[PDB]
Amino acid sequence: KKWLGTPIEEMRRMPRCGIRLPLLRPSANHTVTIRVDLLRAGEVPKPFPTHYKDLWDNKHVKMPCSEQNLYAGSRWELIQTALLNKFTRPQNLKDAILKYNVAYSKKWDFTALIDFWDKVLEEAEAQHLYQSILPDMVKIALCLPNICTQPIPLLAAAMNHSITMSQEQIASLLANAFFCTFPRRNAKMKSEYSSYPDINFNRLFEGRSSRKPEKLKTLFCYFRRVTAAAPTGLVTFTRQSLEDFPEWERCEKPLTRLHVTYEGTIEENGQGMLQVDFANRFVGGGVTSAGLVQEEIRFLINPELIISRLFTEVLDHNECLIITGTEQYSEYTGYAETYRWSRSHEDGSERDDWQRRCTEIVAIDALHFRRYLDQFVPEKMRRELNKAYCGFLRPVSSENLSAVATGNWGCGAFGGDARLKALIQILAAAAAERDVVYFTFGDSELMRDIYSMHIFLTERKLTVGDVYKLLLRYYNEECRNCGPDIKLYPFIYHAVES
Numbered sequence: 001k002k003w004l005g006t007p008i009e010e011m012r013r014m015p016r017c018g019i020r021l022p023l024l025r026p027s028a029n030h031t032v033t034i035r036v037d038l039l040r041a042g043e044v045p046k047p048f049p050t051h052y053k054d055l056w057d058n059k060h061v062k063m064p065c066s067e068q069n070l071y072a073g074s075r076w077e078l079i080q081t082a083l084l085n086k087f088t089r090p091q092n093l094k095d096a097i098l099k100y101n102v103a104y105s106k107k108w109d110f111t112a113l114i115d116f117w118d119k120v121l122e123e124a125e126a127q128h129l130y131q132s133i134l135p136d137m138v139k140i141a142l143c144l145p146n147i148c149t150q151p152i153p154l155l156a157a158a159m160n161h162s163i164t165m166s167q168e169q170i171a172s173l174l175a176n177a178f179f180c181t182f183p184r185r186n187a188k189m190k191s192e193y194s195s196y197p198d199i200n201f202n203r204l205f206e207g208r209s210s211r212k213p214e215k216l217k218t219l220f221c222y223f224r225r226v227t228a229a230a231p232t233g234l235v236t237f238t239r240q241s242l243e244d245f246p247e248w249e250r251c252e253k254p255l256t257r258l259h260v261t262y263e264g265t266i267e268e269n270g271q272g273m274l275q276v277d278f279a280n281r282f283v284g285g286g287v288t289s290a291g292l293v294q295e296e297i298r299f300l301i302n303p304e305l306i307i308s309r310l311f312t313e314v315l316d317h318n319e320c321l322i323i324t325g326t327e328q329y330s331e332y333t334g335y336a337e338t339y340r341w342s343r344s345h346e347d348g349s350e351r352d353d354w355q356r357r358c359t360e361i362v363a364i365d366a367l368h369f370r371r372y373l374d375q376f377v378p379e380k381m382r383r384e385l386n387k388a389y390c391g392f393l394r395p396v397s398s399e400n401l402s403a404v405a406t407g408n409w410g411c412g413a414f415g416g417d418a419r420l421k422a423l424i425q426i427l428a429a430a431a432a433e434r435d436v437v438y439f440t441f442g443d444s445e446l447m448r449d450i451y452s453m454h455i456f457l458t459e460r461k462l463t464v465g466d467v468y469k470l471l472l473r474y475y476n477e478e479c480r481n482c483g484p485d486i487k488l489y490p491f492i493y494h495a496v497e498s
């Protein structure tokens with residue numbers, strides 16, 4: 001069988017399962033950068049306010065077009081002069097970017113940008129790039145003060161706050177990131193913003209990996225689309241930080257339903273579900289540098305995700321980032337060394353009443369384990385449970401919650417055990433009262449094992465706490481004084497049947 005458990009057709013999805021959205025309005029915990037009274041399907045949203053307002057401080061994005069962005073001369077004037085030149089060769093673009101980044105002219109390498117333009121693209125593609133795409137990217141970047149007129153607060157640690165902005169505003173900001181115009185975001189030894197991810201794209205231009213051309217094709221697909229015809233929708237970015245976490249050993253909740261399959265993907269087969277991003281604590285991971293695994297791929301085919309890096313501080317253990325409304329612009333094949341851009345993608349997702357695509361993605365960062373046994377330590381298991389729980393919980397009735405679409409979170413490079421991490425997500429979803437749709441990405445044996453454990457536990461009516469106590473026993477009996485002699489799932493079967 002290609003899938004096991006509850007049919008996926010019986011799982012809840014957006015928009016059909018959602019509650020009527022309240023009226024979109026700014027508030028103390030919701031920044032809204034567009035005119036809600038003029039928001040209409042198929043119309044480009046109007047920025048609010050009408051005239052640029054600047055905030056240059058430690059609570060807001062430092063905009064490149066700020067009159068306080070100085071070097072004293074105006075850095076924004078310098079950016080304008082540098083970018084409003086014909087490009088005909090990749091060195092022209094390098095030289096332009098470095099005119100307002102002089103301190104980094106010896107530090108930033110542009111080999112991948114030069115190789116892409118000169119050595120990957122055929123002549124006609126290169127010509128289209130410098131005659132049409134790059135000039136159009138410059139124009140939308142330089143339009144920033146007319147597009148992003150409202151200060152953008154930082155989603156800082158411990159903040160429970162949301163930003164809703166237009167896809168068009170995101171395009172202007174991402175064009176600026178491409179041209180590396182965001183100030184104070186560059187120095188390796190920075191104090192300010194040291195707890196924020198990279199946003200400027202300079203590391204996309206360095207080195208000779210065969211990955212970078214594929215990353216650039218994926219991003220230029222997006223840039224070509226959104227400069228040719230402005231997207232009309234909205235995107236919400238919500239930082240969520242919980243303080244009340246379950247007493248896992250005493251939770252009497254039953255497990256919820258499971259669909260597990262070794263075929264399909266989160267982004268295609270989990271349409272309308274809560275889609276997990278296997279994130280780095282710096283959201284987006286290496287998307288703007290060398291990474292090209294699950295999180296980076298998603299940030300490339302849905303580039304509006306990338307802008308979360310402009311304003312999202314590194315996630316603490318009790319926090320996540322929820323992004324609603326990003327659009328898929330590319331299709332791809334493979335991953336890492338085999339990742340390839342395939343073609344442009346026309347997103348068919350419905351939009352909700354806030355004109356957001358009905359696509360909800362949650363970034364939750366797993367721990368990186370130096371030693372395999374480290375992850376069975378109770379404090380580490382509880383950490384992962386609470387992280388997933390924070391990502392899944394919507395402080396909303398269970399009937400209005402979509403299923404969670406996820407997979408082997410934190411496995412591969414971070415050393416997580418897929419069978420443990422699957423069980424941890426199942427418990428967290430149960431506590432948040434959501435069903436689970438689990439993609440094993442080609443591993444048929446894992447699919448069978450997860451299904452078998454799930455139905456074993458549910459048929460015996462074990463609670464979340466019952467299972468968590470079994471994890472603690474496994475640690476104590478097979479890990480603390482110990483790889484272990486007995487694997488986790490066999491241990492559980494034996495303990496319960498005994």
Ligand SMILES: Cn1c(=O)c2[nH]c(SCCN3CCC(C(=O)O)CC3)nc2n(C)c1=O
Binds near residue numbers: 441
């Ligand atoms: C359910 N699910 C996935 O699990 C998934 N994984 C990926 S790429 C992950 C390749 N990465 C390479 C380096 C390795 C190391 O360095 O250890 C580890 C693994 N795309 C995915 N999608 C779309 C999906 O739906």
